[model samples]
Target chain A: DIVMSQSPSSLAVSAGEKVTMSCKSSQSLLNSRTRKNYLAWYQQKPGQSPKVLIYWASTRESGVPDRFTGRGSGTDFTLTISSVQAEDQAVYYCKQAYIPPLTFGAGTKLELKRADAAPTVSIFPPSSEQLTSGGASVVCFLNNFYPKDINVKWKIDGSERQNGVLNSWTDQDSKDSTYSMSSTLTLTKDEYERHNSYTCEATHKTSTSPIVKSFNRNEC
Target chain B: KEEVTIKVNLIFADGKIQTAEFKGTFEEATAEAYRYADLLAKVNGEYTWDLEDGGNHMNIKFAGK
Candidate 1:
């Protein structure tokens, strides 16, 4: 259950402005066996279900546009929308396919930020803690949310975490008129402390919250 | 020789059920039974296959853990 968080809950892009979405994982999603990132990207248009845009970090899913690209690994990953379009005014998300309880970023809404309009963007710090060991597991719980759609990811610093397993579940959040989701991340302790810091992020249409946690194995 | 009568049910995708003949080798019968199991798994709703009876029979029921 890796936790995923995004930056700038919402972005106002001109018709052709380059829109960038950042996805951070709570822990490494790198496969120790293969040394590859099992991350993926997805896009959702208004009223439509999310469609897979990219998988394995950089490989674009079938029938996706060339404007969408995913890059980075081991906790820090970026999804770039080269030239925004009117049709692109939707929500974007990133997921780590490598880990189970497959987690997703909350989502970033893309809109036309008027030239003269000043819109505020909210970003939350990463929340979640990591314990250092050859093998360790971290769990993230999300509650009291709106829009019913959210994702959890494990990332280090700003890169997508690799070689870990993740799991998540969704529950009805009646209080907020939305749904709540939780994700868990499992990784080998050996690589945990080596990474700078781990981040657990949650994003939605109007806001994004990322909570950063750190670990050190040498102390143990 | 002991006589044994094994009753099996065959379900179609359209929600119809019929009795199937169990006159084949164990391996062949096992494969034939799982064919419907695969179909049942893809039936959209929360249906599951039951194999508690051992041999090669799966009971399809509505929404149970």
Candidate 2:
């Protein structure tokens, strides 16, 4: 996998503002024989899939807006929007297409120049609060966050847990334009009875600190 | 390019898994896998491209687009 570093992590722009960002690869992305760079750019709008905007570094993907342009080659590349539109408020990621194990950038966000909003974090038991002989499930809900991108984790007894952790897609709220998602952690009766602390930790671009919510058998 | 038999595993975010085979050269198979992995990453946020046995066998893991 190749390393990619995207700059400015995020940007605040109004409509018609010129937007420019840079992405650099750890090694040369250029193929000397073909005279092309094995690189691409993508745009991901809130609640939508990422769309390819450029490939081979400088060539625009079909049907992409003319305002969206790509430049540079080798290890350095740039994505510039001549005039940013409201619909362009999203995250831009760079990818290296040189090999089978491709790599992507952490992404640079384009915000609307408004105040950033933190998510409302909450956790609760499944609808069937009654303990099933089989097991128990706890849900962590994140609501109404701006900028869409987030990382969620489930921790038990202060240790990170991976198995039995499921996350829902971050969906946008049509009414408020905010995004929401959820994560569920299933536990066996024995594990639940241990009285260990369960925590749902979420990190977002809105704040410098993570938003964490906890659950325990005592509270149930 | 000559075609060869290879297997791939397509995993969806909703716990659905599908298996498929590709009878294409290594370059072709890898190119196709790149497209598949790219699409899946957009939705699932993570994926893996596995090529083994000197390209005679490859297993691509990705979420459904």
Candidate 3:
């Protein structure tokens, strides 16, 4: 399923800076008959749905700005912004339309190099009702963030835990226009009681260090 | 390369159906269907197409043609 890999997960650019990003697929996406690459580019701004910027590798979609351009063929492709505008500061994604299960790039965020709104991280332990039940889950919420690309994980007893961890898609708050996302860690009540420290750590591009919040049985 | 027959049924808003068939490779057929559906969507407003992979063949159900 990991067919698409993007470079430079996030980039901080000035208003007039020129930017370029790469999206590579594992296999060639070219059709021999049509001689066209089955690739597309999409741009998504905060608080708005994604818009198709380019399709068929290099053809700009109708009404798209001239500054945005796509080039390359087969598995290797690039989406370049000729002269970045403040309005163009958003996340760009490349998609492969070659086969079933169309895949998307991890996403590249073009953000201003200046200070932006940083997200606030909060970790919630299982509720009393959940604790009394057979199984429970801990929740981690990161809210009011800008640029929209964030990494979050759960650490059990100081070790990063993978299984039973579910991360939600980033969402835009209609009121403030900032973004918010959440992750949950699930476990049985018996397993939850045995764990000493359950930590939720988050990293944002704007921050120098990760935000860490822990949940212990004492907090219950 | 062996060619396979691709058939598509475009269902319109008035409960009408139209069929288009062609011969091409697996990739070509898929691309043609996508193109046809996209064209129909642009000219007709809205539609739904679900691409489901069959072990023996490809199935794309187009609604709101």
lDDT for each residue of candidate 2 in A17-41, tens digit (9 for 90 to 100) = 5566667788998887888899999
Each candidate: chain B TM-score: 0.41, 0.57, 0.66
Q: Supply the TM-score for candidate 2.
A: 0.43
lDDT tens digits, residue span B1-65, model 1:
11222234434445444333232455544553454334334432345455656665555543422
Residue B35's lDDT within candidate 2 is: 51
Model 2 chain A — which ten-residue stretch has the worst lDDT? A169-178
Fnat of every candidate, listed in order: 0.00, 0.00, 0.00
Best by lDDT: 2
Error of 1 at A75 (Å): 0.1
Better of 1 and 2 by TM-score: 2
The residue-by-residue lDDT of candidate 3 on A68-109, one tens digit each, is 898888777888887766677678899988886899987776
In candidate 2 the C-alpha lDDT for residue A7 amounts to 49
Q: Which order, best to worst by lDDT?
A: 2, 3, 1
- Per-residue accuracy of model 1 over A33-58 as CA lDDT, tens digit each: 98779888777875679888888788
Q: Chain A vs. true chain A, TM-score per candidate?
A: 0.50, 0.54, 0.53
Error of 3 at A149 (Å): 14
